[PDB]
């Protein structure tokens, strides 16, 4: 079980320790470098990432329309947003506030 | 020791004992693999030919 | 050492030490590849950046 | 007269392939390198201890 | 956690070597402006007068030699001030200075604020005379990149 | 990088001037050689493996010879001063979401169709002054644009106070509210930055941008929030990476065309240009024509590169040696 | 506290982590902490010699190392050549309740 | 005009007009050919098996 | 140049020695860091892409630490003094052919079974003295050996005038005996030369030699005409081509093992050793033992190289910074 | 309106094969770099002249 959680925590929450010169920065017990490669969340957050303080529909609709007008066709602009339970209520309050206007 | 022409790149190499991954990489027997089916096309909406 | 509780082998033909203990060792290699990171869009709260 | 030999390889050299940037050679008993098409590094370690 | 990780497939490799692939991109460019000079070589400031009065020659410096002999190139305002190049580039280091003109029937020139640093120029076409025309225009190439991963 | 050529371009590095052939001892030396009847000019240079010469320039057949400084080959990093539109509202409206878009245009590939959009946002509140807005939106832009996770440097952003008015205080993604303590911030400056450079494989290329504003509801209409003006640049990318990629290309003319292709077996050409120094560039552009019916010309150019110390000491001594030896009036720069 | 890649010590009220393990703070994978030995004990407290993983040249902030920060286990990365033993497993126990008449 | 991954050592390259062998080798489209039938064994009278 | 390892070996170029982590600003900086309890030693250094620390050396688990000067690692070139055998005849006997066979032993191949021979011949005359013999012998040797279009140089030939007796008179293939005017020559010095070198691909190697003499008919007796003794060496091959190969190998234990292989698809490592500069080497050899049953040692070493100018300034300051931090007693060269 | 284009190649490019260390691409009319597999250089020149 503990070896199963090691495999899954490395596939998502993995962080690379190599320089831009090519050198690794952490060495093992035998002195050879620990060659760690990144995971799902580290390799994918190096582009297209927004760090917001408060969420608004004016932010996300503009973030997803300047993206889609530049890169996607007309019939290709379907965005399935993966989120949590609290992010759905935060989504719900903004499209309530937009429709109430 | 020496060269057989004007342009010889390598000299002969030798070592003793424990071989590591750079012992093979300094004798040119360790190369990255080309993943040919993996290919990235950068995403854009191309408005030439329009 | 003498016995192996991980397998149930009482007695040892090839002893590692004399302590009368048992150690298990496991290893694995793994990897993940993300081809294009410009094709995933993320909005993260600012308290999670650091 | 009694004699001995030893040679340690790392564990990761079990199925270590050689990428063949240069040819991989094998020292013979006569004192001549001969080129070899064996892809495994353990094929060349097992010749040298013999 | 694994139900998240089981939405991603598995791709199977032969060894624990670094692997690489090809990243392919795009080709339709334009070139920014460095500075513009009139026919006696004075750099055109923003408060200057018009530069191409009476189809007078003047100069455009670019960070690279992307343009050709007879091509019409246009700035931010496309087709309002079309500039037809006159002669090949004189390479001032890594800086191609083209002697240009003003087509379109333009008599009173191009304003000086249309010839500043950061003004982008793209290629329209290369128009020639009907009788005894000499060769103009040229042909351009591009090349891709690569990326890499480990274990 | 790969440059265009007028049928050839060859480069020689002028690390020193020796004035005769017998003084060529260290590499990188140059001697402008000519005869008394000024019909032939050439440059004897000491390569890393022996004395080498150039093509023999016919001095009746030069087309131009003009030398450029190191201040004319430096890319100026473009600035944008982002302020509040006083016609819209001098102070921030206490309810609205204030969003700023940065429209990048040469993200990872060459075209103007490979775009990238980054954002900063401030929810404006009651009693928030115009200075506390810029303290809060330079923090929001820095967490998006100067983060530690991004693959490339995108912009450098700064705050300018009203007391100092010229000095930049840099705001990073690790900068807190308690570090920026001034009540007289009047603008936000978004400046271009220098991209990474690998010798001969990744050229010097820049990502341009445009700060764009979203619309806030002021009275009943959605007015665009701000105005962004191009400020005159204060930071330049030096000349070293352009010339080191210019030696590397023009060295293949006189040498091996494959630089490392297939690596057990390469011919390691040793280069003499330091990528961390600024250089002056002199271009003699000439041709060849014979005394026959073959009167067409074969255009050629020879580049000479010398270090610039700020007063152009090495290049003007190189120019002056060519002027006496060859009788050409190359202009002192 | 972890400028360059410098060792520093993390004090926990129990021995729950093992040698060679990556442990994370509240900002989990931004600052991954690698255990550089065994937990030398101080009463019930177990102090851990720790260096930072990733390409973390800047260090770990002093407000990310205060009393109350919730740490968890990630994995134990090891080198490709001449690797040595790392990691450990953990166990638990239940409780009971009664009633009367 | 930047980098998409950490280890992107190539940038997109471009030029105009007349193309040289120098222009083709700098975009990595020229490489020396290997004469596989040509192999040289260094001449000696080997006496290691003697 | 592949070397042997006991286990993994790491090298760190010490181009400048600082006193804090914060002072590390240029590629090549170093600082030895330790505790105030002296139980752990590591080397923080500035890589060409940021700050990088070394492994943590347990100061109880060190085996040896020794510092090697530059002149210990400088190869002394082998000299051979060829004279006429005084027992045979101190003057050349007339009409005899004086042939000399230089026996090279590690010519291009790697063994003693790959051999090569270069000859020199002089047929003596009626009035030929000893000095006129050594003149024509060295003209004939340099004509065969040091032709310009050979593959590699093999040995250098030097006459010695008996009046000078300590200054080498260089004899090449372009040398005529009109240039060699001295009348008192007493020996011919044959001295091996430094082979070419490419970092990583071609190691530093030498082709040794012995001069051998064919017999002449002196008084009806076939006697070999000369003797060849080995005089003390007067030249040294400097340390720089040995340490740059020591860095090219030890930058795959930290960095990339694939150096160049799929050529544009590589990481390129920046090497901080100038190959035309001498260095001093410090080898701190240490090990690791596990907790309870993992008592096998992982015996490894951390190499440090510092450029030194005559008197070893940069290494003795490096050792003095290590000795006050670690509590060690590394001796100062 | 009368227009003109011109491109010049050396005579060394008659049968010039491309040893693709990176893949050789074609510029499309749409603006997309498409990967191509023809190894002759004049196949790519005739694409861009048209
Ligand atoms: Mg992303």
GROMACS .gro file of C-alpha atoms in nm, chain G residues 3-7 9 19 36 38 49 51 57 80 82 84-85, chain I residues 7 40 42 44 51 53 56 288-291 293-296 298:
model
   32
  738UNK     CA    1   1.953   2.864   0.012
  739UNK     CA    2   2.163   2.683  -0.243
  740UNK     CA    3   2.086   2.331  -0.132
  741UNK     CA    4   2.172   2.356   0.236
  742UNK     CA    5   2.071   2.121   0.519
  744UNK     CA    6   1.634   2.065   1.056
  754UNK     CA    7   1.512   0.822   0.551
  771UNK     CA    8   1.878   1.329   0.481
  773UNK     CA    9   1.734   0.906   1.041
  784UNK     CA   10   1.790   1.672   0.877
  786UNK     CA   11   1.737   1.952   0.227
  792UNK     CA   12   1.795   2.766  -0.533
  815UNK     CA   13   1.976   0.501  -1.101
  817UNK     CA   14   2.422   0.188  -0.675
  819UNK     CA   15   2.053   0.217  -0.126
  820UNK     CA   16   1.754   0.156   0.098
  893UNK     CA   17   3.270   0.476  -0.713
  926UNK     CA   18   2.903   1.778   0.760
  928UNK     CA   19   2.960   2.042   0.140
  930UNK     CA   20   2.818   2.537  -0.260
  937UNK     CA   21   2.371   2.800  -0.743
  939UNK     CA   22   2.553   2.251  -0.381
  942UNK     CA   23   2.733   1.631   0.199
 1174UNK     CA   24   2.874   0.662   0.337
 1175UNK     CA   25   2.750   0.388   0.571
 1176UNK     CA   26   2.386   0.313   0.642
 1177UNK     CA   27   2.205   0.278   0.970
 1179UNK     CA   28   2.267  -0.345   0.838
 1180UNK     CA   29   2.365  -0.116   0.548
 1181UNK     CA   30   2.726  -0.106   0.666
 1182UNK     CA   31   2.882  -0.133   0.321
 1184UNK     CA   32   2.988   0.393  -0.076
   0.00000   0.00000   0.00000
